[model samples]
Target: SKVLNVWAMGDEAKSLKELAQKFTKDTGIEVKVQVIPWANAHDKLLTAVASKSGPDVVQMGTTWMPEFVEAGALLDITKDVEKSKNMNSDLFFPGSVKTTQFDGKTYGVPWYAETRVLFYRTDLLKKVGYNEAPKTWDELSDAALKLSKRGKDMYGFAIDPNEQTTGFIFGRQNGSPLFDKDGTPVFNKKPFVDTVTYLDSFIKNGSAPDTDLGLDASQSFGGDGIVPMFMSGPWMVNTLKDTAPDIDGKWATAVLPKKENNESSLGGANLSIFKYSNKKDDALKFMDYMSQPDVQLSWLKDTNSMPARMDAWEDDMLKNDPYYKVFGEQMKTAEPMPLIPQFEEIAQLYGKSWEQIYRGGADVQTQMDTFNDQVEALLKKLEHHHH
Candidate 1:
């Protein structure tokens, strides 16, 4: 007699029907699912919001939360999440927790989480007299250099010119705020400046080759030994299995090598409710149901996606899986990029500057200085746009 509408894309859309059926049987509410192409998701949702006919609930990229929160299209679920016995802020992974917040209020419940881990060739590391993976940044850089000396056509490491996520992690690990409290870009400071300089040396001295934009990291690592050592997320596991079958036992994963500290980048999607939904109570109830460990486990059973909650991994299915062990450890080190209304704009700027730095045309500080200026103006605009 009652109905709830939901929108999701990709694997989530493919597998969500089964869960919706179960929820319907348990709660007496029929659930309708809408599949949207991710390429068009932003504009699609924006149009729906503009017309005031959006779905009761929708799946949003974790990074996309700030924009929707700014647009006031998302319901603030902080109180609902707090009152739900099934949900606890402490139980979910900390990195994913950041995406759900805006100016200290919670807006979304994390559905799944992702962070980078070290993916290196074992035989290649063996040739460098190191059976153990590097535990610190210094050790990693040295290992990459040694590997390059041994590797011929293949470089020891490769940097994707478009990898926009690393700088966020680097700034966090170095103990600097890429942005200040009011959201000013403060990345031109000491520790973060040190981080870029260190990464630049890898490309300059031939440890990590400056691969052109859009080179698939999975192809470079699995099919060839072009990158003997690199960092990537769990999807690379599936990609490797299909594309480079021969390298099965030759590769492995490890927690990200530390700088002064160990922290990795955060990226994933979350389930959100619309501010204007008439069935807000039922939609929030569905969010609570999805947040349960059992439901998260069910999603993982269907897809290789990692859960956002800590207990999901403690369950027998994921706990015993050897492939996910390193990533499980890395979950502890993951931190969310700064939650800013202007995050997408700033992220694009960082990506552009990184593309320039990775290609090696100018001094490190010079590029960072110019990038900082762009960051300041964008941050100012973001703060103003909010009012």
Candidate 2:
């Protein structure tokens, strides 16, 4: 077929189709864009792999890279990647580039990237004697203590109870690779233990709610100021804009406060060529166009997604925009999760242990030992099943 089959996920799919029209005009290769729901994407991808059929290019959640690569669903594009003038690992954000390679082989190119940052009320910070956001773990804790007034139904910082990546971010900040040479999931180590204790302090000291508040952070952030600060990704910009217009210039963003150094987790999607695709050359061309600085900047404007390319941050709009400047700085230090098939499940298991230690008042050491056993056993189970 003359048409390039491309599968993009949800909202990204819509914007991609618009870009494809321009791509067709320039390259003369027609594109057929398909929207795949996030909920069904994983299962659908696996089925496509098994059937030996799928789109030429697919948008894969970054963490899914190791699994898809192991399943032989993704084409090894190392040579093409090296030949690509527009897209190479060195051209992308360090954290985002981590997801493109698995076991030393390049399988995808980052389509976009997102990293966490401190979103706080500038007015509220000034009231607490802080002209700028907190800079260190100690400062963050101190600010949270001062910002909180639980008696008046206000809390200092909003912690999403269900968030899975916070521990990893802290772990990375503390300089943990998070996995040993043998690939064992080592959560009982000092870095992870420190993370657990650090997070537990907020709940124990009444700086944050102990359980799920059931209300969105944006609501608490701009409404009555129940939560004057929170850590979130780029999506919150639009969410806050649409949901809390009145708080216009009152808020600002900063890179996450440091323990050793500020490090957040990298997120967003990557573009991969399917192993079975006959349109591999066309797929690379499309990926190259998408990776261009101008195309990435345009995509950022259309989607509010941070560009994966590090050079894109030099644009006047991104470099001068205060909010984007913070994110760009954070992206440089953000770390990716271990490129392993079990990481996604391990991360969920990791998030579940937090409530027990914090809200449940369980001891960190005790909870960590139990949690470590569960993850270790799960990893063994998955490995054995692979054969």
Candidate 3:
């Protein structure tokens, strides 16, 4: 067989190449890696599929698995995964694995998983008279307000106005399903309005910075001391440690603030096999090697991503990390973002709706109703095309 060519995105490409070397060393399979930037990944992948020039294996976001599956760009791996000794449904987190399934067929394997949670300064919280992490939306609001009163320099929270990502987390927390059973938008619902209103309170009440609506989450959280608390994922763990090593133990992670029940946005990538590949056997072999418990542990430790494999959590490397444990617990309640081909469009629309409510001070119900109407039209077009 020829060397299996794999196309992956940015840092993920480097990580996969290192893992591929390990796979070749152990199994004697030649592998090649092509790195593509994250910004260009989607277009490149789509182009490759259209031209039938895609690699044997690819790294994909879980949310995209369904879209690719529907486009006939992914191989049906259900039987292969089921028969593999190293891969099984029970071995991976249910929610994480579920994201790679569409219409009952599995399309990808969760390489790793990520979910956002509250990252806060313990010292600041204690200074504000908080003994433990806030458990509910009301509690979070109260804490933010209290923390804001400490001094002129401190802020209770920082948020990204790019609501595509942040809005999903807030909507889920407030009990709004981004998509209805029939695949229509539900953004104008009470849950969405209430969630946006609550989020706006942080900025409106002077607890968060006004610049948040214009900045990325990392920039807002890491720039100066403007933001003492924010919601973020494991990717920021190492960045913070390296940039502000002095604050090592001062920062901590916790579950996202909940309403009646805990909920979080599903944020992560998955490993997928391209349908156009000629190296199916070798690709499957590589996936098997990567899915091994020891291999998973190594990748998680090296990359700082939370492993998707359930058993990987039991490893001492993961069990010893107190910060990761917070995310581990929160993963149980997280939901994958909607897996549809029109995800990008839906995300853009949702963000606009949120901005209208939060920044423009539009009436929540009116904005929501308009959003719902647009969603119905969009879903109808998607269904008509049947792609």
Candidate 4:
């Protein structure tokens, strides 16, 4: 029997089994699914590449595309994708689609999409005279001040310095390109500097807790919760329901508060064929199957993942749900992280400086300047090594 090996991560690995069986039944091609822990995925993928032994199909984080593409681990599927009627770049969200391309060549298919939005306690906001969620930076800051009761161990908002996207999203909202046309680091500019300063003000002004509070975002949000608002992705929707059942009706989701725009960070997995696979045709077949709008919708039903396909949101199932609707709308404006191999390291460095500024009382301007210089040096070294 012909078989295809597919590697997936986290809960999606378990959830993908039923669909695998259905595909097997439909095509008479056996499907074997393997689960890879998120923490180990990067190393395991690199190991697979080193040994030339890996699955026929693999699910990769969108941001990981650059590294894998540079390493020659993924099959170039641009022509195949163009030939397929159901699998065109235009079918997915523009931002999600952007990650699947490297240097203008398509290598992966956007399987699902994720973007952060505000998750706030509706009732708690009403108590502070905000009938609806705050829509702008000033309003959010004002709400944070009004909702906080730090004396009672309650805070207005939850800010995570470790979440690297926080600063980037705010910077983008303020019109920071984040990187130049040549992908050079540009985070020390006024827009990003202002963004970092603004984030630090939340913790410094007692409107939010530093990372030390260690409160779970799900548990801290809703039903007289200590922290009434936070920003997170679709996965948190399920986590909140399972973890805080009592806060069901009290909370709702909204697009991130606007500075110049309400843009948030785009994140999600993409499906790709491994270049080492002998079953390239079969791999493309599976990728094509996954790209169908109906199949994508079914995946959403199974996984609570927002589909990458724009048309999937047109279905009444998603159009009727206000919560999912927020993600759909936000995805329109959401932007992906820089498509560079060093992005993970840069994000980590940015996060370290973020914690320093907000938690260690480091100066925002000086920290950002130092961080950008380090990034510039790092990028220069990478170029030196390449040529």
Q: In the order shown, what is each candidate's alpha-carbon RMSD?
A: 3.4, 3.0, 2.9, 2.3
Q: Could you tell which candidate, 1 or 4, scores higher by TM-score? A: 4
Cα lDDT, model 2, residue 70: 84
Model 4 scores a TM of: 0.91
Per-residue error (Å), model 2, residue 373: 1.9
TM-score of each model, paired residue for residue: 0.84, 0.86, 0.88, 0.91
User: Model 3, residue 380: what's the lDDT?
Assistant: 89
lDDT of 2 by residue, 246-326 (tens): 789999899899888887888889999999999998999998888777777887865567888877777788788777888
Where does candidate 1 have its weakest 10-residue lDDT segment? 211-220
Candidate 3: where is the Cα deviation over 4 Å?
Answer: 1-3, 10-12, 26-30, 37-39, 149-154, 210-224, 357-363
Stretches of candidate 2 exceeding 4 Å from the true structure: 1-5, 24-54, 150-152, 214-217, 278-282, 302-304, 358-361, 381-387
lDDT of 1 by residue, 1-387 (tens): 257999888656766777888888999888999898766787787897799888899998877888889888899888888777666677787778888877778888888888888888887788788798888888888888887776555677655555567777777777777777766667777777788887887888788877663456556676657778877776676567666776788888888888767788777788999988999988988888877777778776556667888777777767776567777888766766666666676777887887687774666678888889998887667668656
Candidate number with the higher TM-score (2 or 3): 3
Q: Candidate 1, residue 8: CA error in Å?
A: 2.8
lDDT for residue 151 in candidate 4, whole number 0-100 = 54
lDDT, residue 78, candidate 3: 93
> Candidate 2 — number of clashing residue pairs?
0
Q: Give lDDT tens digits, candidate 3, residues 1-387.
A: 488988887555667788898789888889989888766777887898789778898888776776678779999899999777777666788888787777788888888888888888787778778777888888889988888786786678876675356877788777788777766677777788787778888878988776634544444455444577888778777567666755657778889887867787776787788998888988888888888877777667776788888877887868878777888888878888876776766777877877786678787778878877887888888778866
Candidate 3 versus the native: TM-score?
A: 0.88
Q: What's the residue-level lDDT of 322 in candidate 1?
A: 59
